[PDB]
Design a binder for this molecule. Structure first.
Ligand SMILES: Cc1cn([C@H]2C[C@H]3O[C@](c4ccc(I)cc4)(P(=O)(O)O)OC[C@H]3O2)c(=O)[nH]c1=O
Ligand SMILES: Cc1cn([C@H]2C[C@H]3O[C@](c4ccc(I)cc4)(P(=O)(O)O)OC[C@H]3O2)c(=O)[nH]c1=O
Ligand SMILES: [Mg+2]
Ligand SMILES: [Mg+2]
Lengths: 201, 201
């Protein structure tokens, strides 16, 4: 909830794909369904952030097939929420002196993706939560105290972002050793409130 | 253009509606076309930021008719660029040590608007410029040196935004007296480079 007028609430940016919405599991399900005769990558075997790069190493042409999954209508809209994500963000947004924004990057093909990201937020958090969405390719220009995001290295135009990046565990980053003092949130079952409280005055 | 790796480019947020895209003129044209039997507000007579509030004072029910214009498919997409806007932003983006983002707020009804804002940017600035778009209801959480925006009072979750707000003149704000030392850009013919240079070290 917002701080009193003029006051300064803790500000938390919560990523969408891989944090709120199960991009990797959705991707694999639809890839298997659409391309049953191709090899796939089990979630346990995912390595590197970019799904299509691993698929391309698997077999010539599989990268383009992978891309066609997320370019398709209803791919973003039909992603399942991660366990605990909706409940946690609803709780988080209800906390005193706490402003939560959902901060997400749309893909390059923009016909469906931005629209469906709005629709997905509406479906799970309600119409009033649409006020909290920020779409950007560059999260470094968004100022906050915390950014909870599955992408290990987040860089952009601002060489010194204001947020602390808390790495949200995902199949593709779960084996990564991080530079101290970088922190992880394992899942939404993990103690996200402690992380927030550690940033409060 | 981006600063050298690690370096810090001047960062300019450029608003879309009323700065790049002629929302007010588009609105009036389509309102007149759709509702030829209703009274309208000449651009010279626009007062207050919110178009629908003035229309509602004009006649009971006109507010809802006004809203239906911008909720319609192709309203955002078919807006004409303001004179000089495309040329200026292209020049601006080519300047050394200068990062330009188009920062826009989508309307509440999200079926068309975000999509069409991406499409409009693609149409006028090209596909690579899509990397520069930030969609947000709250521009105070976007960090930059400058925000060129027609809306007179821009507030939100960050009580002390990092940008200087330069008011871009529009039919609805052209008579407003501003608090010193607040600055205006009259139009894209006006000397926007001087404004930028005044923020450079
Ligand atoms: C968010 C995300 C996206 N992707 C896919 C989606 C598509 O997203 C992108 C992408 C998405 C956002 C950014 I910033 C940069 C690149 P595309 O360039 O827009 O198509 O990168 C190539 C593709 O990789 C992934 O494989 N894993 C992810 O976690
Ligand atoms: C950008 C802009 C929007 N509007 C119209 C558009 C629609 O935009 C909104 C609007 C848009 C952005 C914000 I932040 C807050 C409100 P809507 O609540 O999304 O429908 O406000 C009511 C309407 O007013 C205007 O009348 N003038 C403007 O310059
Ligand atoms: Mg992510
Ligand atoms: Mg505007």
């Amino acid at each position: 909830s917002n701080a009193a007028s003029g006051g300064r609430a803790l500000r938390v940016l919560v990523d969408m794909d891989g944090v709120l919405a199960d991009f990797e599991g959705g991707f694999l399900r639809k890839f298997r369904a659409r391309f049953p005769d191709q090899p796939f990558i089990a979630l346990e075997d995912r390595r590197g952030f970019w799904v299509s790069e691993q698929y391309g190493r698997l077999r010539p042409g599989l990268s383009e097939k992978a891309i066609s999954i997320w370019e398709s209508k209803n791919f973003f809209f039909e992603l399942e929420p991660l366990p605990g994500a909706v409940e946690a963000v609803k709780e988080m947004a209800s906390l005193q002196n706490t402003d939560v924004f959902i901060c997400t990057s749309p893909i390059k093909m923009f016909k469906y993706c931005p629209y469906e990201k709005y629709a997905w937020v509406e479906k799970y958090f309600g119409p009033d939560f649409l006020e909290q969405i920020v779409l950007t390719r560059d999260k470094t220009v968004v100022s906050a105290d915390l950014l909870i995001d599955d992408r290990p290295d987040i860089t952009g135009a601002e060489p010194t972002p204001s947020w602390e990046h808390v790495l949200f565990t995902a199949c593709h980053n779960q084996h990564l050793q991080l530079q101290p003092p970088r922190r992880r949130l394992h899942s939404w079952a993990d103690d996200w409130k402690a992380i927030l409280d550690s940033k409060r005055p």
